[PDB]
């Protein structure tokens, strides 16, 4: 079946043999193939539009430098807590071997709880004037690697109500390690990084948001091509 | 107890080769370099693993 | 990576590493924390796998006694280049450089040898370090230098392939002598007469 | 078992309070020092028993090289169980049987 | 000797998980794999890993030198594609419980008969034997893990002149 | 007590642009990463018939040709698919199974591939603003999901397993020859020639 | 089905004997040193690199020489008048002679210059008897006669002088 | 004296066997540090 | 088996030559006889050298 006409009627097959998510009875005529047992729900198998303009980078906390591990980092930052869901991280290097990431969290929850809610509310063309202030938590040690291939790692999320499942590419594997800063450089660490972060939040440009489209224009024509 | 060692180090003064012996005492945590030319003295602390090689090494950071 | 201290002799029982073209040997310690993990609980976390198991956790103590001197990455990569014997006199820049040259290659080259490929180096030093103690706690028979499963034997292909290449870096190395003799005549040498 | 720093991950080491008369965990490289819970600051076993039936793994039904014998499980009752002696090799090793069965793995003796 | 990539593109893609994704703490139970001495990642069934790789290497697919052991009481699963092992051959007995064939032979008269032809009905010879999964090669390192009857009188339950085989009562049964 | 080592209180006064989501979780906001096999591959693009059987390539090597046709068609694909009622709907090729016994397996037609979960803690994943140079957090990747093919017979593991078999068959480098003079005549016919230009060059320079 | 008896044991090992032989471990061992190992030992080193920043006008040129293919042909006699021939063992043997084989390598030699090549003869390999470099390995029975060489021999050894 | 507290269990079954007495082996600690270490030892009645 | 005390799984050979060896017994008493051959190559070296040593 090397035919490339071949190879096109095994594709055009593969895409009508989708089955309805719907149809409770062809879903439970397919059975595993090993284990001999029916199906009980389907996803639907779908690329994310909104968010290939982005670049999403897979961030691990690597032995001691655990948040859960640290327990008074864990007590002040609450016991899924909203802070963690919010908090924003500031990669600086003073210098190619001298690196370090800085952590920022909203140390109140009420805040972080009204910040988490607008952004993942975020389907109209009205957001509010949220002056967010972000205090420093601790600094990291990182490392990074890439992947060769665009991608090599994929994250899965659902939604129940169109029984889709959006998956979206993973750039690269950032890890952090729990550094111990010299004495010796405190001096210079003062004037590195800040105590407070304030976030604004403001509609995106026009311009911006026609760059973006114009990214996304690569994998969806059909909605974003302009004209 | 202080410990007198023979080196084969260069002094950076005189330039004469083979005229560095180091004195590490261990009781009070100190490494002195002395020139037999030069008379010159070069102190730096020590610790439980120190080596006449690192005494070396902090006079050459320290000349630098 | 011997293990010092004979039977209730020589105080604690610290375990020192060799290293190749290093004059001395190291304390674990120290190596570990060269590679690049400083703190003491992730070193624990890589040699065992049982924190119930206090009888390893006792062996190790020393060590950690030991090695508790040097606490950063940096400063250990100084203290193996220095003992490096390489050249005296060597900068700490250029120690360092050293340092990371002689740790990434030629310690378990067999493992890897490409940069930023580590971790899997300091996973085989805790595995070394398990298997090391596991013996020494009795727990384990010593391995059998006899057991005929670990031979290998070299046919015509291996032996051969040793002496070939003996004898291809010797003309290697005749073939470069030549040519540094030839290029001051600025000929356009033939390379079928630099060849033996 | 012995704890280690919540925020250095360095080891603790044990101290006393000459003013408070108490015990307490203090790291070397940080001033975190946590209040000690046991007086038990250190053991030593001069004869051990440790490592005689830790040796237990739940694929061990899965060796073929093991006999297999019909000792009565206490757990399972089954009728099909597998024996091996002490894992622990010393010199001075008893060679008593420890029966693991294949559903609950227990393991015991025909003492 | 063989090259060890095929070996750890099975492995990876029969769920062996790298060593970056290791947590001692994590993964008390897991087994480490060794390729060729260096441990390369973990799994946590290792009972179906070891039986794929065997079937595999039954099967031709990974080439039939390639030692595979599986040593369940250090809870390590070893794989050796190197050069220089000493291996011999070895009959297969059907061990599987599910099969009625539990305890035979795989050999059949129907290979005897195709070896002395000299051909298979729709060259047979012994390389066929041993792709086929009758017959497979063990080295030094493997036999510690595997039991093997001396004839295949063996594989089921008074003269002076005949000598007298081992009575092998320690065991209940025999696998 | 390890007091706060910031304390200048300075505070940067950044607003980031934030475009609405297509979709948004409901109940958690929690994400599985997944490895991608060898023998699966993702297209993003819509699927367009006319180029993909135009770009076809055939290879004499037959491992690699039988390697290209399984990964194309075991590749995650989409295409829009035209309604009955004349409107435009995303179409995918692609579903997930959910088992009775609660495992999920990833379907491309008819090929099913189990997936395996292992529960990873401390794992986010976050949104990457270079021109800011500053990283925003997304969600969590609580599972680790690991994509293995369901069975022996599975056409996916037969393909791939001839392929990798047939793959470690082929090994001839050496290249033979055949000869048909003295290897040693040109060295020496060489050396003659460059005794010769050595005695010419010699009488040449004691002559200049 | 029906049991196997010790007759059927003696039949299968009678098939690997006439697949494997006695001594296939040596031809193996060599066949393989011969076809991959060679090419593998000098592409180990695949690059000679002089360079010289002439100023005697800054102009840095490299001279480097890079090894490419390995060529082999089947053992050949070079007679002192200079007639080439192909070789077999029995003449060597008779001779005093060393079945071997002249290697054939590929060198490229490049001169960058920044300012700021054939099948050269390495040597003769010797050749073990029977193997895939053999000239007997052909010939069938027949000929294997007419060559002096006795069927029952089964190779797996060189001949040196 | 110090708080830290030096205590060690004497397996019974070897001390019977060997013919010793709790009070013999204290003694021969005292004799061999004098008085620079305060030593109890239980009675032969204990559990331990 | 494993942890297998037996006479016959430790190299008692219980049929007599004019019986018959089965392999295992073949490969035990084949072991032994290795040991007396190398125990007598060996010993004979040092039977000399005292036997020297003692004369001069
Ligand atoms: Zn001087
Ligand atoms: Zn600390
Ligand atoms: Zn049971």
């Not at chain 1, 096109?8 to 593969?14: A, D, I």
């Not at chain 3, 003491?40 to 890589?46: F, K, P, R, S, Y």
């Not at chain 3, 080259?109 to 020494?136: D, S, W």
């Not at chain 3, 003996?166 to 356009?188: A, G, H, N």
Request: proline share 4%; glycine share 4%; with cysteine.
């Amino acid at each position: 079946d090397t035919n490339p006409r071949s190879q096109l009627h095994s594709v055009e097959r593969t895409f009508d043999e989708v089955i309805d998510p719907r149809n409770k009875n062809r879903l439970q005529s397919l059975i595993h193939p090993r284990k001999k047992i029916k199906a009980v729900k389907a996803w639907h198998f779908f690329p994310d539009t909104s968010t290939f303009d982005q670049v999403f980078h897979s961030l691990k906390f690597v032995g001691s430098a655990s948040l859960s591990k640290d327990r008074p980092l864990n007590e002040q930052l609450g016991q899924v807590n909203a802070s963690i869901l919010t908090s924003l991280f500031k990669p600086i290097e003073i210098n190619p071997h001298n690196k370090w990431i800085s952590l920022y969290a909203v140390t109140d929850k009420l805040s972080a709880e009204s910040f988490r809610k607008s952004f993942n509310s975020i389907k109209d063309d009205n957001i509010v004037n949220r002056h967010v202030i972000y205090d420093h938590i601790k600094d990291f040690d990182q490392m990074f690697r890439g992947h060769k291939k665009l991608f090599e790692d994929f994250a899965i999320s659902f939604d129940d109500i169109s029984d889709r499942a959006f998956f979206v590419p993973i750039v690269g594997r950032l890890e952090l390690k729990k550094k111990r800063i010299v004495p010796g450089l405190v001096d210079m660490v003062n004037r590195t990084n800040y105590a407070h972060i304030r976030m604004d939040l403001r509609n995106p440009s026009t311009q911006e948001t026609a760059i973006r489209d114009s990214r996304r224009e690569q994998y969806d024509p059909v909605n974003y091509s302009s004209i | 107890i202080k410990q007198k060692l023979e080196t084969q180090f260069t002094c950076l003064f005189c330039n004469h080769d083979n005229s560095v012996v180091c004195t590490l005492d261990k009781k009070n945590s100190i490494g002195l370099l002395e020139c037999k030319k030069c008379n010159l003295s070069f102190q730096a602390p020590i610790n439980s693993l120190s080596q006449p090689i690192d005494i070396y090494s902090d006079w050459i950071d320290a000349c630098e | 990576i011997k293990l010092y201290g004979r039977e209730d002799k020589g105080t604690g029982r610290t375990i020192k590493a060799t290293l190749p073209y290093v004059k001395q040997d190291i304390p674990i310690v120290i190596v570990f924390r060269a590679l690049g993990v400083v703190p003491d609980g992730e070193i624990l976390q890589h040699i065992c796998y049982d924190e119930n198991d206090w009888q390893m956790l006792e062996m190790l103590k020393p060590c950690i006694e030991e090695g508790f001197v040097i606490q950063d990455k940096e400063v250990a990569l100084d203290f193996i280049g220095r003992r490096g014997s390489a050249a005296l006199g060597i900068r700490r820049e250029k120690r360092i450089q050293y340092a990371k040259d002689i740790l990434q290659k030629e310690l378990l080259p067999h493992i890897t040898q490409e940069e930023g490929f580590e971790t899997r180096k300091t996973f085989f030093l805790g595995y070394m370090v398990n298997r090391l103690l596991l013996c020494a706690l009795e727990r384990k028979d010593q391995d059998d230098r006899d057991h005929f499963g670990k031979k290998r034997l070299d046919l015509a292909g291996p032996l051969l392939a040793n002496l070939f290449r003996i004898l291809f870096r010797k003309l290697t190395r005749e073939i470069y002598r030549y040519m540094q003799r030839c290029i001051e005549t600025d000929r356009d040498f033939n390379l079928n007469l630099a060849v033996k | 078992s012995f704890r280690f720093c919540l925020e250095c991950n360095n080891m603790l080491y044990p101290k006393e309070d000459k003013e408070n008369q108490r015990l307490l965990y203090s790291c070397r490289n940080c001033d975190y020092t946590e209040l000690a819970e046991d007086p038990k600051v250190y053991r030593h076993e001069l004869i051990t028993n440790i490592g005689e039936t830790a040796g237990i793994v739940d694929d061990i039904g899965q060796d073929p090289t093991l006999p297999r014998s019909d000792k009565e499980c206490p757990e399972c009752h089954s009728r099909d169980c597998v024996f091996f002696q002490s894992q622990q090799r010393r010199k001075d090793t008893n060679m008593t049987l420890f029966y693991v069965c294949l559903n609950c793995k227990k393991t015991f003796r025909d003492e | 000797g063989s090259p060890s990539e095929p070996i750890i593109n099975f492995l990876e893609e029969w769920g062996m998980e790298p060593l970056e994704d290791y947590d001692p703490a994590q993964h008390t139970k897991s087994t480490r794999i060794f390729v060729n001495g260096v441990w390369t990642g973990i799994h946590r069934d290792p009972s179906m890993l070891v039986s794929t790789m065997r079937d595999l290497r039954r099967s031709g697919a990974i080439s039939p030198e390639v030692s595979i052991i599986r040593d369940i009481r250090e809870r390590e699963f070893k794989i050796f594609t190197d050069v220089g092992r000493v291996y011999r051959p070895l009959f297969i007995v059907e061990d599987d419980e599910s099969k009625d064939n539990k305890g035979e032979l795989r050999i059949t008269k129907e290979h005897i008969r195709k070896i002395q032809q000299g051909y298979d009905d729709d060259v047979y010879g012994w390389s066929s034997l041993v792709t086929s999964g009758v017959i497979e090669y063990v080295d030094g390192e493997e036999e510690e893990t595997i039991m093997i009857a001396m004839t295949p009188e063996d594989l089921q339950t008074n003269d002076t002149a005949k000598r007298i085989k081992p009575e092998m009562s320690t065991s209940s049964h025999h696998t | 007590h390890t007091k706060s080592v910031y304390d200048n209180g300075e505070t940067l006064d950044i607003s980031l642009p934030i475009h609405p989501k297509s979709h948004i979780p409901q109940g958690k906001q929690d994400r599985w990463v997944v490895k991608l096999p060898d023998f699966l591959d993702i297209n993003a693009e819509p699927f367009d018939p006319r180029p993909f059987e135009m770009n076809v390539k055939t290879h004499e090597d037959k491992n690699q040709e039988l390697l290209d046709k399984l990964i194309a068609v075991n590749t995650v694909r989409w295409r829009y698919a035209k309604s009955e009622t004349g409107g435009i709907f995303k179409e995918t090729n692609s579903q997930i199974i959910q088992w009775e016994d609660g495992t999920y397996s990833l379907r491309v037609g008819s090929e099913i591939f189990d997936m395996f979960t292992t529960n990873t803690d401390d794992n986010y994943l976050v949104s990457e603003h270079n021109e800011e140079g500053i990283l925003m957090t997304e969600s969590t990747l609580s599972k680790s999901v690991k994509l293995v093919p369901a069975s022996f017979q599975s056409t996916t593991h037969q393909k791939l397993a001839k392929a990798l078999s047939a793959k470690q068959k082929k090994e001839s480098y050496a290249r033979s020859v055949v000869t048909k003079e003295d290897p040693e005549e040109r060295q020496r016919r060489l050396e003659s020639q460059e005794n010769e230009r050595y005695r010419l060059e010699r009488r040449r320079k004691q002559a200049e | 089905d029906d049991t196997i008896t010790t007759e059927d044991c003696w039949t299968v090992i009678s098939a690997f004997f006439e697949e494997k032989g006695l001594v296939s471990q040596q031809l193996d061992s060599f066949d393989e040193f011969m076809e991959t190992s060679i090419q593998d030992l000098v592409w180990e080193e695949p690059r000679l690199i002089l360079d010289q920043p002439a100023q005697h006008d800054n102009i840095n040129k490299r001279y480097e020489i890079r090894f490419g293919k390995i060529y082999l042909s089947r053992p050949t006699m070079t007679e002192a008048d200079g007639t080439t021939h192909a070789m077999f063992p029995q003449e060597a043997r008779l001779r005093n002679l060393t079945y071997s084989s002249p290697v054939y390598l590929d060198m490229e030699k490049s001169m960058f210059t920044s300012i700021d090549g054939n099948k050269v003869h390495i040597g003769k390999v010797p050749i073990m008897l029977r193997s895939k470099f053999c000239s007997l390995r052909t010939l069938d029975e027949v000929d294997l006669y007419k060559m002096k060489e006795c069927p029952y021999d089964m190779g797996g050894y060189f001949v040196i002088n | 004296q110090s708080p830290w507290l030096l205590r060690l269990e004497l397996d019974r079954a070897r001390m019977l066997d060997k013919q010793l007495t709790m009070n013999q082996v204290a003694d021969k600690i005292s004799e061999v540090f004098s008085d620079d270490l305060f030593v109890m030892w239980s009675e032969d009645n204990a559990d331990k | 088996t494993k942890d297998d005390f037996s006479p016959e799984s430790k190299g008692f050979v219980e049929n007599s030559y004019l019986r018959g060896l089965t392999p295992q017994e073949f490969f035990f008493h084949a072991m032994a006889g290795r040991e007396g051959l190398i125990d007598t190559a060996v010993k004979t070296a040092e039977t000399g050298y005292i036997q020297r040593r003692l004369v001069k």
